[PDB]
Write a protein that binds this ligand. Structure first.
Ligand SMILES: [Mg+2]
Ligand SMILES: [Mg+2]
Ligand SMILES: [Mg+2]
Ligand SMILES: [Mg+2]
Ligand SMILES: [Mg+2]
Ligand SMILES: [Mg+2]
Ligand SMILES: [Zn+2]
Lengths: 52, 190, 147, 205, 196
RNA sequence: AUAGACAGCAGGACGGUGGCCAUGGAAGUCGGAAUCCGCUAAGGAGUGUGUAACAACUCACCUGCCGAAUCAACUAGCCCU
């Protein structure tokens, strides 16, 4: 098993993110708008699904 | 609107020498010399004071966008002051579930070879940016020490390593395997 | 060995299960036994769920019963009880007096909770409007009259 | 099924109401025009919010039904099943026609009734919600959702009138005290200072 | 109304300092509502517990410097979470008993330890733990007859330093906290006087 | 909002009470209505996570550091989707 601090560190780059509900782009956890021009910088954002 | 004037001033340590060649900033300190060129931003740079130096960035008649580069330049200069005084130390940690990631440093920190990432027989040869030295930590295992004077070069070198160890065609929520930046600090502590 | 537990029971009414069964079964006393002996300890409350605090020692145990803020409802208000299936939207309320609100406040002053009478009178009055009870009319008018 | 609403968006024909000359009109989709607490007294729901049309178009009966359901549903969630009263101020009286083309041409093309629409004017109120003042934000939000069931542009306007009456809210209380506005169920009755003096006598008795 | 609350707060503090010229100033931080509440029920009819923003504290002194010119020396001194408690009758008796007013709580995290606290060697009945921490820091812990015993008397903590996370967590499990959250005296005002 | 805001860095977020009905479970957080009071700087009959119910975290609210503006909604021009 992965040590918890390393468990959390890897999740910071893979899991703890926000997802656009129009272009699915990976966004930082504090995102309020998507950064991709294809969606018109929408505010329709959802958290990235967790395995738990 | 167009704002008449917007300026931000950055202090300079007594052990640091900054010279200006137009918009080119040359910062000299104990750890070395850093040069940056700011010809893409129409601003006015001035040096103030003689007993204690001080750099001022001036912008006249800028729009909202042109206004944003004033702090950008100041932050870049402060990073350069940080680099020549204390340097930059980006610590990377290797995370693996089953297959340990074997990192060997070659050409005096210039080439990083990554082996057994996910069990692959592919060896990753990652070339550090010039002026950036990579080493394997001796205090703690599975840790890499990236040291350099330019935050942009040191951080880009870390980014190259991090994106080298990328899991493909697998659920990345599991399979949390790779080398990740764990700490951002300085070679010397103030 | 000294142990103190603080759990709430329905009191007069007996429920199928509670939050105490996984905690009381292991010690030696069955949940049904401790449910029933507390239920008979209540006796007259019937409806409201009464909180009980008890201490368990090496061999024996002692129990004590604490009431609610204002549980003297059945004797003060003359209403026939409904079935054990309860009822849809009972909406219970009626009229209340003054001698019993001070009496429980006097007994509260014996238990020394929160503060003294001058502020705790409105405490009971505010709760009475929350449940729906009235002291010979709406409480806000009564509050203005006394101050 | 129904043609898309884009085929009957514009008030292109003269009004064609269901009458003795227009038989066999299917019943409109919307039947309940008032919902919520219609009985609430004039003084219980002073705040009024209106959805106002900003185009001269036709709103189908199905469109009116969907917005009514959408606004009702949200208001129950935000204020309660009896914390408001919604009145749809448009009744679909204009019958639209369809010339059924089933595999002759444009010969004898005058169509048969298909449905009903409500010809709306720029500034005509589409639907109104009256509730307590503390629920203004919900009434804007509820009316905001119902806007997506209609074609064209609509504007939400909080009326300065009192409830569903035609009298200003800032002076409604004064007129009631002076007996020029007798609460009559949902609305009020205006007491003109005229007519037999017996009526004045009863009011002041 | 916030303005009325503020004005009411302003007027009550002015009359309270007028009523009582004797006060103790304390630091009520990392304690919470219950701690100031618990003091209140104990000192219900003897002293009053009051505080607020440092801003209205300095504004009250500015608005009352004309009546009492001895308050000018407190303007920059007042800092942090103030815990104004006002007395009238006694000086040394209230000083001791208020100093005695402490409330046991959980293990502190970040509160410096100016003294060393020794842990008696006795069985506690815990499960297995990693001995790598003890070996690295240099504390000899032996697993005998199921429990854990310490051989040599080694100072577990440093005096007058920032408390470490490991020590706080270790103290939290054993549930014996020598240091507990409560009211700390820092300054006293009595007719323009300073005392320890 | 200079009686100190906004941002950021930290503490409190209480008692009645597990408010009423209902529900097997419903203890602020399945549902419907009430949405009140000593106690202060504040703490709700709760903005969310969470539990079978708890617990626990957390939010509003408020305080420490800080020292000038800031926050929310809407509207319509060009541009973008
Ligand atoms: Mg697959
Ligand atoms: Mg990776
Ligand atoms: Mg025509
Ligand atoms: Mg529309
Ligand atoms: Mg725009
Ligand atoms: Mg275009
Ligand atoms: Zn997007």
């Amino acid at each position: 098993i992965i040590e918890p601090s390393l468990r959390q560190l890897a999740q910071k780059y893979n899991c703890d993110k926000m997802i656009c509900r129009k272009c699915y782009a990976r966004l930082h956890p504090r995102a309020v708008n998507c950064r991709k021009k294809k969606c018109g910088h929408t505010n329709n954002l959802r958290p990235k699904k967790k395995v738990k | 609107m167009k704002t008449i004037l917007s300026n931000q001033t950055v202090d300079i340590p007594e052990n640091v020498d900054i010279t200006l060649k137009g918009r080119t900033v040359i910062v000299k300190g104990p750890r070395g010399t850093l040069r940056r060129d700011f010809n893409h931003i129409n601003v006015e740079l001035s040096l103030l004071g003689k007993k204690k130096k001080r750099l001022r960035v001036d912008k006249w008649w800028g729009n909202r966008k042109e206004l944003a580069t004033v702090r950008t330049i100041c932050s870049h200069v402060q990073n350069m002051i940080k680099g020549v005084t204390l340097g930059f130390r980006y610590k990377m940690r290797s995370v693996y579930a089953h297959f340990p990631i074997n990192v060997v440093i070659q050409e005096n920190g210039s080439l990083v070879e990554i082996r057994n990432f996910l069990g692959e027989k592919y060896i990753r040869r990652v070339r550090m940016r010039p002026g950036v030295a990579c080493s394997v930590s001796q205090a703690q295992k599975d840790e890499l020490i990236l040291e350099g004077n330019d935050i942009e070069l040191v951080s880009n070198s870390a980014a190259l390593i991090q994106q080298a160890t990328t899991v493909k065609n697998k659920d990345i929520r599991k399979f949390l395997d790779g080398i990740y930046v764990s700490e951002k600090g300085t070679v010397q502590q103030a | 060995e000294i142990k103190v537990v603080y759990l709430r029971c329905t009191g007069g009414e007996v429920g199928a299960t509670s939050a105490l069964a996984p905690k009381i079964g292991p010690l030696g006393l069955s949940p049904k036994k401790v449910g029933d002996d507390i239920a008979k300890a209540t006796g007259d409350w019937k409806g409201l769920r009464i909180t009980v605090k008890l201490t368990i020692q090496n061999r024996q145990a002692q129990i004590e019963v604490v009431p609610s803020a204002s549980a003297l409802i059945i004797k003060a208000l003359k209403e026939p009880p409904r079935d054990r299936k309860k009822q849809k939207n009972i909406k219970h309320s009626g009229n209340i007096t003054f001698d019993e609100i001070v009496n429980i406040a006097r007994q509260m002053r014996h238990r020394s909770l929160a503060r003294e009478l001058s502020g705790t009178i409105k405490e009971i009055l505010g709760t009475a409007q929350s449940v729906g009870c009235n002291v010979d009319g709406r409480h806000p008018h009564d509050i203005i009259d006394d101050i | 099924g129904r043609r898309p609403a884009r085929c009957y968006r514009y008030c292109k024909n003269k009004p064609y109401p269901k009458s003795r000359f227009c038989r066999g009109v299917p019943d409109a989709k919307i039947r309940i025009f008032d919902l919520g607490r219609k009985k609430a007294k004039v003084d219980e729901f002073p705040l009024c919010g209106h959805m106002v049309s900003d185009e001269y178009e036709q709103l189908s009966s199905e469109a009116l039904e969907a917005a009514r359901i959408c606004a009702n549903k949200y208001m129950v969630k935000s204020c309660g099943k009896d914390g408001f009263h919604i009145r749809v101020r448009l009744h679909p009286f204009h019958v639209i026609r369809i010339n059924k083309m089933l595999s002759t041409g444009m010969r004898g093309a005058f169509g048969k009734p298909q449905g009903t629409v409500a010809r709306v004017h720029i500034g005509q109120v589409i639907m109104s919600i009256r509730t307590k003042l503390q629920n203004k934000e919900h009434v804007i939000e509820a009316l905001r959702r119902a806007k997506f069931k209609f074609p064209g542009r609509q504007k939400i306007h909080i009326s300065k009138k009192w409830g569903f009456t035609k009298f200003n809210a800032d002076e409604f209380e004064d007129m009631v005290a002076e007996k020029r506005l007798i609460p009559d169920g949902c609305g009020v009755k205006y007491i003109p200072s005229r007519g037999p003096l017996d009526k004045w006598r009863a009011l002041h008795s | 109304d916030r303005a009325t609350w503020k004005s009411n707060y302003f007027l009550k503090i002015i009359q309270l300092l007028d009523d009582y010229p004797k006060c103790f100033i304390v630091g009520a931080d990392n304690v919470g509502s219950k701690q100031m509440q618990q003091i209140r029920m104990s000192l219900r009819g003897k002293a009053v517990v009051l505080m607020g923003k440092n801003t209205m504290m300095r504004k009250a002194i500015r608005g009352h410097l004309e009546n009492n010119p001895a308050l000018e020396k407190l303007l920059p001194h007042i800092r942090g979470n103030v815990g104004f408690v006002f007395t009238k009758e006694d000086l040394t008796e209230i000083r001791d008993m208020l100093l005695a007013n402490k409330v046991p709580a959980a293990a502190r995290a970040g509160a410096i330890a100016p003294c060393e606290v020794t842990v008696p060697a006795q069985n506690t009945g815990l499960g297995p733990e990693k001995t790598s921490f003890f070996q690295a820091l240099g504390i000899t812990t032996k697993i005998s007859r199921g429990t854990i015993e310490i051989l040599s008397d080694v100072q577990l903590i440093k005096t007058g330093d920032k408390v470490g996370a490991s020590e706080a967590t270790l103290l939290n499990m054993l549930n014996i906290s020598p240091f507990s959250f409560g009211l700390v005296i820092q300054q006293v005002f009595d007719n323009g006087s300073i005392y320890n």
